[PDB]
Write a protein that binds this DNA or RNA. Structure first.
Ligand SMILES: Nc1ncnc2c1ncn2[C@@H]1O[C@H](COP(=O)(O)OP(=O)(O)OP(=O)(O)O)[C@@H](O)[C@H]1O
Ligand SMILES: Nc1ncnc2c1ncn2[C@@H]1O[C@H](COP(=O)(O)OP(=O)(O)OP(=O)(O)O)[C@@H](O)[C@H]1O
Ligand code: NA
Ligand code: NA
Lengths: 530, 220, 50
RNA sequence: UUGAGCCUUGAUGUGUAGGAUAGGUGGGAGGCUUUGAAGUGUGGACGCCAGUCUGCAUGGAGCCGACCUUGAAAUACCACC
């Protein structure tokens, strides 16, 4: 049983979680849910053994192995696919690193004859012969080509190369699996495959995610990272929901009862205890208030970001006009001669399903030049806000959080406004002093909203605006973005968001481009799919 | 059929005697064959850890009753000494790569610490069948002439299944009872010696002796 | 109160430790001071733990 | 009526590329089937749905290893699991 004792990690000024001591394993699957800025990923890489915790320890049996899904894409670009998907079993890979390095220099002397001769028995007893073809029909299950998965790791297009890293996680038949944010920005069919395959093997995966479906399919227990503690609720996602809600509501009712019978007692203590001839009748109750002692209540970490988008100078008639749209890089033109026109106030839901130009069209519209389209045009007083799916480049800088937000304080906005626009986002001056590139995916996404607020743009463009974001920071978007009076072009990969937010629909089919007016419900009825 | 009528002829739960079991094997052997009989012993270990594996090789006192065409993978002085050792292979870079390129395999792999041609030429075939020399198994040894005796005298090798059961041929049905007895005993003793350090519990949990086509029974 | 106790374990290999107090809100990282280790009688580096 | 466990018995554990739903060993390579077949007369169970398991037999005495593409070989069959 992989066990952890009294971790108490402190990042900056307040512990994300303190004195956690818990056992894991036993062949169960544990969800790891919590609020978007609750340090769950920090706990995960503490548990794996990457970074040492502030306090306490984490012990795992040395023979039993861990497999963690890392986000370091193109960290393996130098060498090919079929060995980078194998090198995730570190014990059998150093074997090859020694086998293919000792051999080269001539010749196999009488230290080779016993350092490399019985090195191949390590290959045999780690099953090195059935390595590629056991990983071949795992990379094929993922969907990284079918027979072409080979050559330099730069050969596979960076659109979906991270599926190699995903398949690297469970190839080794690992007991402990620690997949972290497994299916962010990912499709649905390969998610179906992952859900079906995860529970085929008998391991002890700890899975951190925010969608209900994945957790319910592949979970057996859940852990929270709320209120600075993880307490394990057995069951499923709905079971955790009902358990947490019921327990918190009963606590906030026990509190009511204790408050009532403390206030009534204190009333008597205040009336008496100063009377000249009845003073000693308040002291049988002064000592009884000292025995009720309502239990500590800690603020829930969920919260709600008060996101409010406001236009600066509204525009009229056509927002944009685009004609000539044709562009292709390797396979051919993803979209050929696409014509659309957007009136002001329109909302577009341009969904693509994993690699049809669903993001590069938005990149062209915001400006990524050299298309065949010669008639892309914006409105005149147009101000554009952009949410690209890659938040890494905007944070590849050593700027602190607040000063980074202060790149765009408009003429009239001060320290007070630039800091209230993130205080509104429940960011603390506690965290105002930290470097920008150290924030989680959801925290970076919300900071990007804190930047979208400043420009007050009359056009909004979002490319999967909800990614690594929890339930509440998606609900705030659903209830704030709908009250925005400017133009909106977005692509939410999920279904409920587009069905409840769309006004017009425009998807790039792998050979052509569609167009339709009416939300995703009516589009679903037109398609025939329920 | 035969195996619907001998299923009642042999009992599974009852543990037979060492001599009585082999007598039953000889009386159950029907199909025309040399029928090299084997024994599977359930070693009590866990395969999840590399330190508890039992990879070994030992010489039987009577022998298996068959000969193996072991290939000497050597070179230089080592590859030249094996010529008069009564082997069935020649150790050289060309005879290994090109010669073994179409060739299937040999019974054993000669120890070639002097040459540099029998290291990885096996590839998928020379390792998939476990034909590579190893120091623990004695396949990769400096005394080619001495290892010739193990190659020709029945140097039986044994390695664990991914569960922890070691099975190997103990002889042929033509062998006599008082010879098969000591033949099995020698392998059992070699396993007892080869037992690893942290092998908790009782290590020999069952000794299932059997033939190729006959039945399989316990003896102790 | 807010400033609680830590100990600076010795990085000379032996079991020795100075004791100090550190404000864990402002400083979230460890302490690194060169302090005299009397078991080995030389100035080594003294990391903090507990 | 049903839980928990054990002995025994019997089924199931395919992509590719290959004849084809090959678990690992490795014993062997020629054995199974006529105290009644490969295929045919015919149900149900399982299923990545292409296929396996299964009453008997009018007729029945004939099917599977060698080749082959594979990291590896085949209910030719038994073993310990
Ligand atoms: N270098 C740092 N200094 C200070 N605080 C940091 C640093 N790195 C991370 N943090 C904090 O640690 C927490 C990390 O949270 P975590 O990464 O688990 O978020 P998450 O969005 O739930 O996870 P993920 O998106 O990675 O799946 C945040 O509160 C963040 O502010
Ligand atoms: N610069 C490029 N070089 C090579 N191929 C590219 C390049 N840009 C895009 N592609 C490929 O063209 C297709 C366009 O994919 P795109 O970038 O639109 O992602 P998506 O999966 O549609 O959506 P999203 O990026 O929003 O998740 C993909 O197959 C991608 O691999
Ligand atoms: Na993280
Ligand atoms: Na994508």
């Amino acid at each position: 049983m992989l066990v952890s004792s009294n971790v108490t990690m402190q990042f900056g000024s307040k512990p994300l979680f303190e004195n956690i001591s818990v056992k894991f394993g036993g062949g169960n699957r544990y969800g790891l849910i919590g609020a978007n800025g609750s340090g769950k990923s920090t706990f995960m890489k503490i548990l794996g053994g990457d970074l040492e915790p502030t306090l306490g320890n984490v012990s795992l049996d040395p023979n039993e192995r861990i497999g963690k899904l890392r986000q370091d894409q193109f960290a393996f670009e130098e060498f090919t696919v079929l060995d980078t998907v194998i090198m995730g079993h570190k014990e059998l890979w150093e074997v090859k690193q020694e086998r293919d390095r000792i051999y080269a220099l001539p010749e196999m002397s009488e230290e080779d004859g016993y350092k490399v001769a019985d090195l191949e028995v390590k290959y045999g007893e780690m099953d090195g012969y059935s390595a590629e073809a056991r990983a071949g029909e795992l990379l094929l299950g993922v969907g990284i080509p079918v027979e072409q998965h080979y050559g330099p790791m730069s050969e596979v297009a960076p659109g979906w190369k991270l599926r190699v890293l995903l398949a690297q996680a469970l190839f080794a038949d690992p007991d402990i699996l620690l997949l972290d944010q497994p299916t962010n920005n990912l499709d649905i069919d390969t998610i179906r495959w992952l859900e079906q395959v995860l529970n085929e093997r008998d391991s002890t995966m700890i899975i951190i995610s925010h969608d209900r479906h994945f957790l319910n399919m592949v979970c057996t227990h859940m852990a929270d990272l709320d209120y600075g503690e993880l307490r394990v609720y057995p069951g499923n996602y709905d079971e955790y929901m009902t358990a947490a809600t019921q327990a918190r509501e009963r606590l906030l009712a026990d509190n009511a009862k204790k408050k009532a019978q403390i206030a009534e007692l204190q009333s008597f203590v205040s009336r008496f205890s100063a009377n000249a001839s009845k003073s000693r009748q308040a002291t049988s109750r002064a000592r009884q208030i000292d025995k009720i002692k309502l239990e500590e209540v800690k603020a829930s970490s969920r919260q709600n970001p008060f996101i409010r988008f406001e236009q600066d100078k509204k525009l009229f008639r056509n927002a944009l006009e685009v004609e000539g749209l044709t562009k292709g890089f390797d396979n051919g033109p993803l979209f050929k001669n696409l014509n659309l026109l957007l009136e002001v106030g329109e909302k577009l839901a341009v969904l693509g399903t994993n690699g049809v130009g669903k993001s590069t069209l938005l990149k062209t519209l915001v400006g990524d030049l050299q298309p065949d389209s010669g008639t892309v045009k914006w409105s005149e007083n147009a101000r554009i806000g952009y949410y690209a799916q890659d938040h890494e480049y905007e944070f590849e800088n050593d700027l602190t959080v607040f000063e980074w937000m202060s790149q765009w304080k408009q003429e009239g906005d001060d320290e007070q406004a630039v800091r209230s626009i993130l205080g509104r986002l429940l960011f603390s001056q506690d965290d105002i002093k930290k470097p920008a590139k150290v924030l989680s995916g959801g925290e970076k996404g919300r900071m990007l909203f804190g930047k979208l607020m400043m420009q007050k743009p009359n056009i909004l463009i979002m490319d999967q605006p909800t990614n690594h974001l929890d339930m509440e920071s998606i609900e705030s978007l659903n209830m704030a973005l709908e009250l925005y009076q400017g133009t909106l072009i977005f692509v939410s990969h999920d279904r409920e968001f587009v069905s409840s937010l769309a006004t017009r629909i425009l998807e790039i089919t792998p050979e052509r481009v569609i167009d339709f007016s009416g939300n995703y419900e009516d589009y679903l009825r037109s398609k025939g799919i329920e | 059929k035969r195996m619907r009528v001998i299923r009642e002829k042999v009992d599974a739960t009852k543990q037979y005697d060492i001599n009585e079991a082999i007598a039953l094997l000889k009386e159950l052997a029907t199909a025309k064959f040399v029928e090299s009989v084997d024994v599977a012993v359930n070693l009590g270990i866990d395969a999840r850890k590399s330190d508890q594996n039992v990879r070994g090789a030992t010489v039987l006192p009577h022998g298996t009753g068959r000969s193996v065409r072991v290939a000497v993978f050597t070179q230089g002085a080592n590859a030249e000494a094996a010529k008069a050792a009564g082997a069935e292979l020649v150790g050289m870079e060309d005879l290994a790569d090109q010669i073994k390129k179409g060739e299937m395999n040999f019974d054993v792999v000669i120890a070639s610490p002097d040459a540099m041609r029998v290291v990885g030429q096996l590839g998928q075939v020379l390792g998939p069948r476990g034909l590579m020399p190893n120091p623990k198994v004695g396949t990769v040894t400096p005394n080619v002439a001495e290892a010739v005796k193990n190659a020709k005298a029945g140097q039986v090798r044994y390695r664990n299944d991914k569960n922890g059961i070691i099975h190997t041929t103990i002889g042929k049905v033509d062998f006599d009872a008082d010879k098969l007895k000591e033949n099995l005993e020698a392998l059992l003793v070699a396993l007892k010696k080869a037992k690893p350090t942290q092998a908790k519990g009782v290590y020999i949990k069952k000794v299932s002796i059997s033939t190729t086509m006959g039945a399989g029974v316990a003896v102790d | 109160g807010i400033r609680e106790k830590i100990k600076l374990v010795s990085s000379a290999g032996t079991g020795h430790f100075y004791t100090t107090t550190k404000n864990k809100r402002t400083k979230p990282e460890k302490l690194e001071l060169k302090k005299f280790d009397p078991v080995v009688r030389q100035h080594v580096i003294y990391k903090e733990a507990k």
